[PDB]
Symmetry: C3
Subunit: 243 residues, 3 copies
């Protein structure tokens, strides 16, 4: 029964699943999960065939389901410039998790969290494009699920400037060989796909409900707050030893 052609069709499907990761036919993904004090989750999907580059602005990072604005916004724009009796908005996120999956090269990831104005450092002419805390690759945890590999990074936004967050996120698809996905003979085909797809969001009342209704349904790699991995698992198939 193990060598039945029907089983080999199943083997084909599973070899396809693992090889599809490395193939040019798959997308890379970064999912940004935002956890609020009401226990709800806002989720952003960032995705591209070869290159993810996105800003999540303040309005993308606050809870837009359990929600004049300028009175508060002016106070997070300039020091002591507010006219609000509310010091910190309830709907600012408590914590985040970044899940990088598909064929990401984690060594190329950047997660650059700033305050409301997006300006690193003391003034715009002194801002660095890559502050040290944006070089997050080595702080991701490498998770495995069978032959699948994904990466997680989680943290707290806090009660300071980054409690009114903006975030720039970018990552490249891993290229294990030398022909660049932006080499002149390829560039125009990938440039045509620079916005496949624009950032997309959803909201869920709790993490447990999101796991059942979205994480499992879309087979998105994930780790819950209690540190349980929720991910599809494709066991490795190979006819010969691997180094």
């Amino acid at each position: 029964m193990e060598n039945s052609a029907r089983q080999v069709a199943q083997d084909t499907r599973e070899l396809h699943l693992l090889q599809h990761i490395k193939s040019d036919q798959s997308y890379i993904y970064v999912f940004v999960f935002l956890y609020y004090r009401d226990h709800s989750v806002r989720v952003w999907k960032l995705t591209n065939p070869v290159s993810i580059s996105e800003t999540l602005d303040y309005d993308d990072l606050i809870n837009n389901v359990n929600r004049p604005a300028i009175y508060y916004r002016e106070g997070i724009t300039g020091n002591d410039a507010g006219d609000s009796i509310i010091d910190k908005a309830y709907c600012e996120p408590v914590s985040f998790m970044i899940v990088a999956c598909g064929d990401v090269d984690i060594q190329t990831i950047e997660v650059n969290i700033q305050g409301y104005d997006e300006i690193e450092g003391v003034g715009i002419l002194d801002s660095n494009v890559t502050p040290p805390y944006a070089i997050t690759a080595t702080k991701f945890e490498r998770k495995t699920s069978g032959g699948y590999i994904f990466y997680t990074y989680c943290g707290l936004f806090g009660h300071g400037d980054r409690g009114h967050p903006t975030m720039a996120v970018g990552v490249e698809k891993k290229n294990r060989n030398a022909f660049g996905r932006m080499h002149p003979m390829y560039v125009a085909a990938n440039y045509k796909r620079r916005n496949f797809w624009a950032k997309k969001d959803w909201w869920f009342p709790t993490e447990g409900q999101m796991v059942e209704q979205f994480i499992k349904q879309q087979s998105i790699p994930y780790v819950t707050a209690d540190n349980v991995m929720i991910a599809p698992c494709v066991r490795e198939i190979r006819h010969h030893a691997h180094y």
Copy 2:
């Protein structure tokens, strides 16, 4: 009178119009028309000097003139996860037409319509960047108006997953020769123009009113519901036979 310099000035204008298509000085365009049950039309202009790449998200595809939301949105996010007494929103589009015009290379077009979550296939790790139905080039109809050529593709969204649509659209400007518009000596000049222009929309109470007030006024190639071509026409001018 036919060889009067004034007539030759007119000839210059019309030769200019046809040659401007192929020139680097013109834009390419994809117009996405969305037709609603109330007979109104929402229109997106997608445009670039050399490379169009855009996502139209759900909120871009529903009727935003003849209009809590999460009760419904949750039900199109996950299976059986809704809390809405409304099964299908009235403002979801009935049908679409894609008009590709200017110097598009129709062979490079992709029109990838997904459901609300934008995720092709059974799970994110198995999604294909190019599902077969996105390779729409050969399904466009080639329309001519004098020396102008444009392409149309129309269809129905339906009452299933794509009745809650998202769409990725991309196309390149035709290059009849070998120097790429993203070749190293050109790339930075076109990259600077990657967002010339961001997607732009309008709305019109009926197709007939849109034809008079917008299609004709902007000289946009178009085909009405009764299959009438509305397009400028520049008759070909040449001093010698053409193969």
Copy 3:
């Protein structure tokens, strides 16, 4: 005291500030200031490590703090197609200033202001990608503040088509040598940063308040309405004569 190591640490900081402009580690910026009849200012930050490309649509250019819409919008979409008793919205901007700063190559800037439909010229097939008024480089004023250089361009929107404005803005970082920032060995690293950062806006009740709470606080080069330069100043340091 002038050669104390503490003073040399200060010299290092100031040499760093000037050299950081030319370094790949800094961003380029275009700030778009929009001045309304109520004396308030809406401000857009456009920024990238190497290449700025942005559209500011109509809704980005009107005053969104001191604020059915289609009755008016239809009248700026098509000629005589409106159904509004209001001929011109109060919240359309009176004037603009463009500040280009950081290591911009001003020779690569374009500021292309159109009316509401974004369509240059008489029809879409005749639109030019670069109308003459978009080639604004030589109309910028070159301002200096010590070793810092920045560029300003200001003007009026008016009471015609451009009184309902849209704008495309793009500029490249100056490259004083031959290795392109989009050369094949660099392109993928900068493409990953194409949306670092998406356009970001703020609003301020008056120019004077914005100067104290934002221009000074972020050390953004600026010129007030009375023609006063507000900018950080780093005096030049060099051990030898300069041509």
